[PDB]
Subunit: 440 residues, 2 copies
C-alpha cells in the first residue's frame, strides 16, 4: 500500500536523494581539497632540507615556489572565472537569490585548483571559503545532471551544498547546520523540507570527512578550566574591546581592496605579477617565522597554551593583521574565516595575560579568553554569533565555558552595531552587486 502512495510524494524524495548525493560529492571533494593542501605544504618544506648550505638560496627557492603557486592560483582564477576570486560566501549569498549566478562550468576546476595554488604556497587564507563555494557549485552541478526544472530545488540544494561544505571544512556538523540559519537567513526558504535536505547533506558530508580523518578536534587543546562566576564581566570587557575593533577590521578590508585594485589596473598580466609577489613574500615570511604568516589553523594551540610573551604577541598580531589584509583583499581564492580565528586567538591570549596579571585573586587561566576570542571576533566582524560560538566549539571540545562565550559574542555584536558597521559577507556582496549594476 506504500508503493502506490510513494508516487504521490515523489518529488520531495527526489530532493532528499539529491541531498544524499551532494553529501557524498562534497565531502569527497572537501577531503580531496584537505589532502591536497596537506600535500605540497609539508612536501614543500621537506624540499627545503637538502639545500641548507646556502641560506639566501634557500630563501629564494622558498620565495619562488610560493610565488609560482600563487601565480598559478591567480592565473587560474582571473581567467575563466571572475566570480571565483574572494571568500566565496558572498558569491553564493547572492546566488541563493536570483542576483548572482552559480556557473559551475568554470569554477569547480578553477576554485579547486586556485585554492590549492594559493593555499599550498603558504598564504594566510584558510579553507572554508573554497570548501563552501565548491559545495554550493556541486549542489548546483548535480541538479543539472538529473534534470530538475523546479525553482525551489535550486534554492534548496545550494543551501544543502553550503551546509555540507562548511560541515567538512571544520568537522562542525551543528555549525554547518546553523551557518545557513544565521549567516544566510534573509536568503533562505525554510519550507519544511529544506531543513531536511540540509540535515542529509551535513550528515553525509561529516560521515565522508570522518571516514578519512580520525580526530576529535581540528584544534587540539585539552580540557581547560571552566569559567566560574564573578569573572564573566572580564569576558564582557573582551566583548567590548572586540566590538570596537570589529568594524575597524571591516573597513580595512574594503579600503585595502580599493588600494590594491589600482596597483594593477584591470589586466591579468599585472594582477598575477602582483599577487605572485604577495604570495611569495608571505611564503618567505612563513619560512622565516611560522607564526606571522601561514594559515590560521596553526598557532591556535601554541597561543592558547600560553607559550608567548606580550611583545611577541603584539608583534604577531600587528604583522598578522598586515599579512591577512595583504593576502585576502587581492581577490585571492581563499577564506577570511580562519585568519579571523587566528587574530581572535592572538588577541584573546594578549587579553588573558593582562587579565591574569591585573586580577590574581580571580584565579584565572589565560587560555579561556583565547578560546572565547575567536567566537567574539567572528561575531564582531561577520555579525553572526550563534554560528560562531558553536563553530569554535565543535573543533575544540571546550564545552564547559559555553556561557562566557555567549557573553563575549553578545558584547562583540552589540558594539559592532553601536559603532556603524556591517557584516563583511554582506558588504562585499552589496559592493559587487553595485559594481555589476554600474558596469551594466
Amino acid at each position: 500500500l506504500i508503493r502506490q502512495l510513494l508516487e504521490r510524494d515523489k518529488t520531495p524524495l527526489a530532493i532528499l536523494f539529491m541531498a544524499a548525493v551532494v553529501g557524498t560529492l562534497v565531502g569527497l571533494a572537501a577531503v580531496a581539497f584537505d589532502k591536497g593542501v596537506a600535500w605540497l605544504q609539508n612536501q614543500r618544506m621537506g624540499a627545503l632540507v637538502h639545500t641548507a648550505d646556502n641560506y639566501p638560496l634557500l630563501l629564494t627557492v622558498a620565495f619562488l615556489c610560493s610565488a609560482v603557486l600563487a601565480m598559478f592560483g591567480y592565473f587560474l582564477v582571473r581567467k575563466y572565472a571572475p566570480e571565483a576570486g574572494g571568500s566565496g560566501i558572498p558569491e553564493i549569498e547572492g546566488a541563493l537569490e536570483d542576483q548572482r549566478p552559480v556557473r559551475w562550468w568554470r569554477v569547480l576546476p578553477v576554485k579547486f585548483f586556485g585554492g590549492l595554488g594559493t593555499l599550498g604556497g603558504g598564504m594566510v587564507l584558510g579553507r572554508e571559503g573554497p570548501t563552501v563555494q565548491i559545495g554550493g557549485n556541486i549542489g548546483r552541478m548535480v541538479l543539472d545532471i538529473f534534470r530538475l526544472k523546479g525553482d525551489e530545488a535550486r534554492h534548496t540544494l545550494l543551501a544543502t551544498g553550503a551546509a555540507a561544505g562548511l560541515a567538512a571544512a571544520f568537522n562542525a556538523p551543528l555549525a554547518g547546520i546553523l551557518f545557513i540559519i544565521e549567516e544566510m537567513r534573509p536568503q533562505f526558504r525554510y519550507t519544511l523540507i529544506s531543513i531536511k535536505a540540509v540535515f542529509i547533506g551535513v550528515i553525509m558530508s561529516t560521515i565522508m570527512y570522518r571516514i578519512f580523518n580520525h580526530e576529535v578536534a581540528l584544534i587540539d587543546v585539552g580540557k581547560l578550566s571552566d569559567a566560574p562566576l564573578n569573572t564573566l564581566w572580564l569576558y564582557l570587557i573582551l566583548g567590548i574591546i572586540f566590538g570596537i575593533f570589529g568594524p575597524i577590521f571591516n573597513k580595512w578590508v574594503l579600503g585595502m581592496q580599493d588600494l590594491l585594485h589600482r596597483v594593477h589596473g584591470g589586466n591579468i598580466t599585472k594582477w598575477v605579477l602582483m599577487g605572485g609577489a604577495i604570495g611569495g613574500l608571505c611564503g618567505l615570511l612563513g619560512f622565516v617565522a611560522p607564526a606571522t604568516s601561514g594559515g590560521g589553523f596553526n598557532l591556535i594551540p601554541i597561543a592558547t597554551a600560553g607559550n608567548f610573551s606580550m611583545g611577541m604577541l603584539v608583534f604577531i598580531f600587528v604583522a598578522r593583521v598586515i599579512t591577512t589584509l595583504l593576502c585576502f583583499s587581492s581577490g585571492a581564492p581563499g577564506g577570511i574565516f580562519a585568519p579571523m580565528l587566528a587574530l581572535g586567538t592572538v588577541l584573546g591570549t594578549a587579553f588573558g595575560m593582562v587579565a591574569v596579571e591585573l586580577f590574581p585573586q580571580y584565579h584565572l587561566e589565560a587560555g579561556t579568553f583565547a578560546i572565547a576570542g575567536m567566537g567574539a571576533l567572528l561575531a564582531a566582524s561577520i555579525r553572526a554569533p550563534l554560528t560562531g560560538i558553536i563553530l569554535v566549539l565543535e573543533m575544540t571540545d571546550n564545552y564547559q565555558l559555553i556561557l562566557p562565550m555567549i557573553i563575549t559574542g553578545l558584547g562583540a555584536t552589540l558594539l559592532a552595531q553601536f559603532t556603524g558597521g556591517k557584516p563583511l559577507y554582506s558588504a562585499i556582496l552589496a559592493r559587487t552587486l553595485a559594481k555589476q549594476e554600474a558596469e551594466q
Copy 2:
C-alpha cells in the same frame, strides 16, 4: 561629553529594550530558582512525611494518597478558577501570543502558575517543570513592559520572546537551547530585527547567571562520559530514528484524543474537574511510592536507566505504564510541560533499543546506554518537530558532546518519518485547537 550625549539619546529606544531584556532575565532567573526550590522543598517534605508516618502499610498508603491529591486539588481549583488558559503546556499559549492571538495576561497568570503550577508539580505528577516557567517568562515580559508603559509594537514581540528564551534557559540550564528554541521553533512567529536577537542573548545570559548563582554547575543528568559512536554503528541510530518517527504521530494523537476523551468525565464545570483531577494526582502520587520510577518528575530515572540498567521486561513495563500515565496526568488540563516526560519516554525506549542492539549485534563493541541519549532527542524531535532545539537541549544537560553526529542522524530519521507519515507538531496543534475554540465560542 556632548557627542556621546547626542549619540545616547538618539538610540534611546533600542537601549531601553536591551535594559528591559536584562530586567526580564534577572526576574525569570529569580522566578525559576524559586520554582525549583519550591518543588524540591515540596517533594522532600512529602517524602519526609511519608517516611515519618510509614509505620503501618495501609496507613502509609492512604497518607501518600491524600498527599499529592490535596495538592492536586489545590492546583486544579486555582487553575479552573481565575485562569482558564494557564492549565496547559505553558508554551502554546505564548506561541499564540508572539502573534496577536492570545492576550498576554500577568494579572491572574503569575499567581496561578506559581501557586497551582507549584502545588501540582511538587506533589509529584508526571508533568515536568519546563512548561510552567516558559509561560512565566513570557507573562512576566509583558509585566515588565507594562510597568513602564513603553507600548511599542516591536517591544512586545521582543519581551514575549526573551521571556520564553530565558525561561527555557533557566529551566534546563541550557544557554544555547534557550536561544535556539525561539530561533528555530518560533520561526513562523519571531521577527528578526537585529535588536531583538541581541535582547534574547541578553535575557538568556542574565537568566543563566541568576540560575548558576543558586544552583552549582555540574549537570542536570548524572552521566559524565559514555562511549563514543564510531563510523560503523551510525546506521544503527537511523533505525531508532525510523522507530521514533513512526512513534511521532502515534504519540500526540493519543494526546489529541485524550484531551477530548477526558472532557466527558466532567463536562466543563469546576467541581467534577477538580474531583477527577484530585483522583488523578492521588493515583500518580501513589504510583510514585509503589514503584518510584514509573511516575514522578521524570528526572529520577535517567541517570539510572542511562548509566546502569533495568531488566528488559522492567523497561517495557516502565515504558507502557509511563505512556499510560503521562497522558492521564497531563491531558486533564494541568500546569506542566511535555518536555521532561517526553525525555523520560525517550530514554527508556533508547535504553531498550540499546539492550536489543548489544545482544543481537555482538560484534560492534556497543555500550547499550549511549542509545538513550539519541532516544531522548529523537522522541522530542519526532513529537515537537523542533530537532535543532532538541539536540542541543539534551546535549546541554547530559554533556555527551562527543556524540553529536548520531543525535543529528536520529533527529533526521525521526523528523523525516514524522513528516512523511502524516503528523503535526504538538505545540502547534494544541494552539490550533485552542484558537479554533476561541473563534468558535463567539459564533
